[PDB]
Homo-oligomer: 128 residues x 3
Amino acid sequence: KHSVLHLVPVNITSDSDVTEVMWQPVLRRGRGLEAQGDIVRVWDTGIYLLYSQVLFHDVTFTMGQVVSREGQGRRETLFRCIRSAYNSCYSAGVFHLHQGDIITVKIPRANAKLSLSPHGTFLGFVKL
Amino acid sequence: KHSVLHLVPVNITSDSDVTEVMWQPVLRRGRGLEAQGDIVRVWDTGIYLLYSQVLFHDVTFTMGQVVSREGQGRRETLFRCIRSAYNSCYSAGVFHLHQGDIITVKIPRANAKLSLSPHGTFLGFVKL
Amino acid sequence: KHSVLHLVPVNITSDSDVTEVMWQPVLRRGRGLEAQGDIVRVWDTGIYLLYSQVLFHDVTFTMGQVVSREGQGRRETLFRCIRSAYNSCYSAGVFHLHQGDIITVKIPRANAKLSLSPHGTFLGFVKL
Ligand code: NI
């Protein structure tokens, strides 16, 4: 029976020129993944479907979300979503994640206006 | 072996200031879900991947789709898709659905111009 | 244990008024699917989740991706993604694929400017 994790915002954090989300579980089955604030640690090695929506509010020229992993201190962008007030940006893919990996959802602009609403912005996992 | 349901439009319905789709199955395996017109009833409790695309045609200021569930008469928005002629809006997530739940895909504007085409607009389920 | 395939660009091909991608595997488990250049052959009949992102660069009026299958020489559009410089377009669905089927990701404009970057443009499969 599939291990799953669906995360929703609690607050939006930002000197570093990026903006992140503190995540909180609303659905969790199995336990090879743990949200710890603005990241999600991977504890069980496997292949995962990973999906991310971000609902943007800014009037900025360009914005989007960047989903990455960092293993032995050397980061990789898994996927990203990009779009030129209110606008959601969805992307997802399937990826080999290892124990020790950290997963992030960053936005490369500082102080980005995003929806905290759980049906607008959310991150999720299905172990396959 | 995974239970799945992929639904495609048959017609577009609208006094209530919303617009809905009458859905029809093109792929179905297993049987804990049943489309009944503009809704999909849930009969088998479980965790489901749920995905929704809507191809919009309107020149309106803002539009998008709103995917919700109603159990004991108290609705919850699971996720939504939003964008500022021809434009598709995709979103998806994983959610705990219970038997008795009704699933809807509504658009909060009246008489919304949407594609009926099965490759533009579609709703789907994978029991996990 | 689920069979999966995640493909990323190697080059972008185009007299025919369309543009395609030559794909390359970065994740592969099981073996009922094979990328052969700009297509992916299906060898194991089954139900698959199929997802496609394309990151566009053009300043064109309209563009998007068209994911189709061809069995006995008679093509069907499974799904498509559409949007009116830098912009990603994501869609996905679940579909019954048969052995012998060819899967394509085409863009109906000639010489389309797309990102080759693996985190911007990508095609993927999960056998269910
Ligand atoms: Ni399974």
